[PDB]
Structures are given as C-alpha cells and as structure tokens.
C-alpha cells in the first residue's frame, strides 16, 4: 500500500559524512514521523531518529552530535545525514513509517535498506586464488581477497564449460578494511580426464576467473 | 536508554515445537508499548506484533504476544518451516525507541559431525606477500564448532577469522570456513600446519595438516 526507495552512495572513507534519501510512494506523507534506523553486519538494530513532514525531529542521544535528519515535502522525502564517520558506522540503513500518524512508533512500512561501509580502503575488485586439498566427493575452492565494497557472488564451471551445481557459500570477513571470502565445490572422489575447474566472481568493480587444478 | 535483553541467544526446536522467546526490559516499558519483529537474511524487520500482543494484519495466529512492565514473551505455538528465523522486539514507550538484541529460532535435527578439508595458500598468494591457510568444515549440526589452528605444535591465536553458512534450507546442517593468515614471512618460518576441529558429532577432535611444500 506504501513503498519507500531509499539511495546514497554505499562506501566512504573515515571522516567523510554519510548521506543517504528515502522516497515515500503511496499514503499520505503527512504526519507520520519518519525514522532511520541502522544494522551493523551481523548485529541488532539501533534507532537514529525520525522527522515529520514539519520538521519536527527525535534522535538517539547515541548519534545526535552527529546526526541531521531533514525532510523535503515537495518530493516526499526525507534524508540522513551521519558526520565523521568510522568503522562503526558500516552498517544496512533502513527508513521506516509508523502504521498511524498518532500511535506508537513501531514500524509497519520499511525501506528495502542501504549498506553503507566506511572503510580506509579504495574499492578494488578481488584478487583470486585456488584452493587444492591434500569421502568419496573430493572439495576445491576458491578464495576472494582484498575485495571492497562487500558485494560478491561466485560462480563454477567445468572445464567443458557445464555450470558445476555443487556450490557452497560463506559469509566475507572483514581484514584491514577490505574483504575476503571463500568458496567450494564438492567433486566426488571418484572422478579421475578434467586437470581442472574455473572459478568465477562477479563484483562491480570487476570480474574474474581462476582455474583451481583437480588433485589426487 | 531503555535495555531490551533477549532470551535464549538461540532456540533449537523441531517444526511442531511451541516456542516461547523472552524480551526482558531494564525499566518498565510503558502501556505496553512493544513490538515483535521477524527477520530474514538480507531482508527488512518485518513486523509481527504491536502494542505487546496484537498481531500485524496478515501475521498467523499460531503468533501471540503478553507480558507487560519489564518483561514480555513472544510465542510462536507450533513452528511452521518458514518459521525459522531471527526475532527482535522493540519499545516505543520512552524515548530513544530501542531494540533487543535478538533470538535465532533454529531447526534441531539429528548431530551431523563435520567432514574436514584443510588447505594450503596458493604458490601465487605466497608471492604476494600473505599465506592463507583454509579449513572447511562441511555439513555439521549442530552449530557449535571448535576450530584450532596449530603451527609447529604452537596452538595459533589471534590470526584466524571464520565464517559460517546459514542452516541448509534441505538438510539443516551448517559448513564454516576458516583462515589463519601470516605474512609469507612467518609461514616461511616453520613447517607443520594443522587444523584441530573438535564437534560434539565427533568422539575425538579431529585433525588435518599438511607440510609446507609437500602439498
């Protein structure tokens, strides 16, 4: 019945200020208060604060030094604005709306969400490199270094070019304000001919492929 | 600020299983001013119950709210497969709005002990500068895994970081991936790398090395 867009951009340096826009489509945009609200990878979430179409603002006292939250009612919209930002401030950035104009303000309405990562890096695409072991269903991998933003997807293929079902995938880790992930393909054992696979990743500052040579 | 303290980190349970999630404030939440949320990987909070015990329009009756003052329950009464999630709950009745910390709701099935790869870095990484040594552990249950890096027989700590996989939407089992990572330098240094995995599926920790250069 309402959806809210939400954009800005998603990497930063430290220092550098945060901004990101919501758009509301449907519903009023009146009265209702409007809040932002944040989720660092892998934890709870925390309110920032909330504006309605007047101007009026609430903010957390955790980030009011440093938060600016305003609106623009000729574009039904509303914006964040987060200074001198670090490390902590990587997070999935929400806007939300309340079901009714005066009931509590829990959130019925939410934005699809926006990662934003504040890192000392510069985006790079990832570095690869293949992963030979040394149960019948032999293991070969993959491994993405020095990749940033946060946003890969792997691939396999055979040599004769057929996808490779078999995927399993982790979660990136975070090293010196860049990323690094792995994956694997289960082969089963008894296949000895292929002297290897291809890995693939697909990330927007590049992609790349690495064959990862069979064992035994 | 208003604690909102949630309990059990995790729920193990079967589809079937009632589940009841507790939502523990650090001062009395006013009127009962409470919601529940459910959330999925990579999605939104979506909300499920407001005001302590109302549900959201479209939310299944198999969900209930109560409580009141400083603590409040959400019950889901037999899990449905979709069920399966992270659950939040959050207060609106004093000012900042807060939120607790969460409780996974996850699927209990039979232990699985994990099957262990460990592997060596690349010759190319090891150009590079940095040695990325791998170990996979595949198909576990239940979630909790020791692994343990041993280099020379020095039991590592402090260079490795590991990631988890989410519970297979199939089979329910979990597979973790973890990396000890030195400088070239170092790796150079010393000869018997070794993974040591211990899981309550396994009767004996498991373990899989290597020699530097004999892979």
């Known amino acids: 019945e309402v959806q809210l867009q939400q954009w800005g951009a998603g990497l930063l340096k430290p220092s550098e200020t945060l901004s990101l826009t919501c758009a509301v489509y449907?519903?009023?945009?009146?009265?209702?208060?409007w809040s932002w609200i944040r989720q660092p990878p892998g934890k709870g979430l925390e309110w920032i604060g909330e504006?309605?179409?007047?101007?009026?603002?609430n903010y957390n006292p955790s980030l009011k030094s440093r938060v600016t939250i305003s609106v623009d009612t000729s574009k039904n919209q509303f914006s964040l604005k987060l200074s001198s930002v670090t490390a902590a401030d990587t997070a999935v950035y929400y806007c939300?709306?309340?079901?009714?104009?005066?009931?509590?303000?829990?959130?019925?309405?939410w934005g699809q969400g926006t990662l934003v990562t504040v890192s000392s890096g510069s985006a790079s695409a990832p570095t690869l490199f293949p992963l030979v072991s040394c149960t019948s269903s032999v293991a070969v991998g993959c491994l993405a270094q020095d990749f940033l933003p946060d946003s890969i997807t792997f691939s396999w293929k055979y040599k004769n070019n057929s996808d490779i079902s078999s995927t399993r995938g982790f979660p990136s880790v975070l090293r010196g304000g860049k990323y690094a992930a792995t994956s694997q393909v289960l082969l089963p054992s008894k296949d000895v001919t292929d002297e290897h696979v291809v890995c693939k990743v697909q990330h927007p500052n590049g992609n790349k492929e690495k064959n990862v040579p069979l064992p035994v | 600020e208003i604690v909102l303290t949630q309990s059990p980190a995790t729920l193990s349970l079967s589809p079937g299983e009632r589940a009841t999630l507790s939502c523990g404030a650090s001062?009395?939440?006013?009127?009962?001013?409470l919601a529940w949320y459910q959330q999925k990987p990579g999605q939104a909070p979506r909300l499920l119950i407001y005001?302590?015990?109302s549900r959201a329009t479209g939310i299944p009756d198999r969900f209930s709210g109560s409580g009141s003052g400083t603590d409040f329950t959400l019950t889901i009464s037999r899990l449905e497969p979709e069920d399966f999630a992270v659950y939040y709950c959050?207060?609106?009745?004093?000012?900042?709005?807060?939120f607790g910390g969460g409780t996974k709701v996850e699927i209990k099935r039979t232990v699985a002990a994990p099957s262990v790869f460990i592997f060596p870095p690349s010759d190319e990484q090891l150009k590079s500068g940095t040695a990325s040594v791998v170990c996979l552990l595949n198909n576990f249950y239940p979630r909790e895994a020791k692994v343990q890096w041993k280099v020379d027989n020095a039991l590592q700590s402090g260079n490795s970081q590991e990631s988890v996989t989410e519970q297979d939407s199939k089979d329910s089992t979990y597979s973790l991936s973890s990396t000890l990572t030195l400088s070239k330098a170092d790796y150079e240094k010393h000869k018997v790398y070794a993974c040591e995995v211990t899981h309550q599926g396994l009767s004996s920790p498991v373990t899989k090395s290597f020699n530097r250069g004999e892979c």
């Open positions: 001062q009395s939440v006013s009127s009962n001013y």
């Open positions: 959050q207060q609106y009745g004093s000012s900042p709005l807060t």
């Open positions: 504006i309605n179409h007047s101007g009026s603002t």
């Open positions: 939300a709306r309340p079901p009714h104009d005066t009931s509590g303000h829990y959130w019925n309405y």
């Open positions: 005001d302590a015990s």
């Open positions: 449907g519903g009023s945009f009146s009265d209702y208060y």
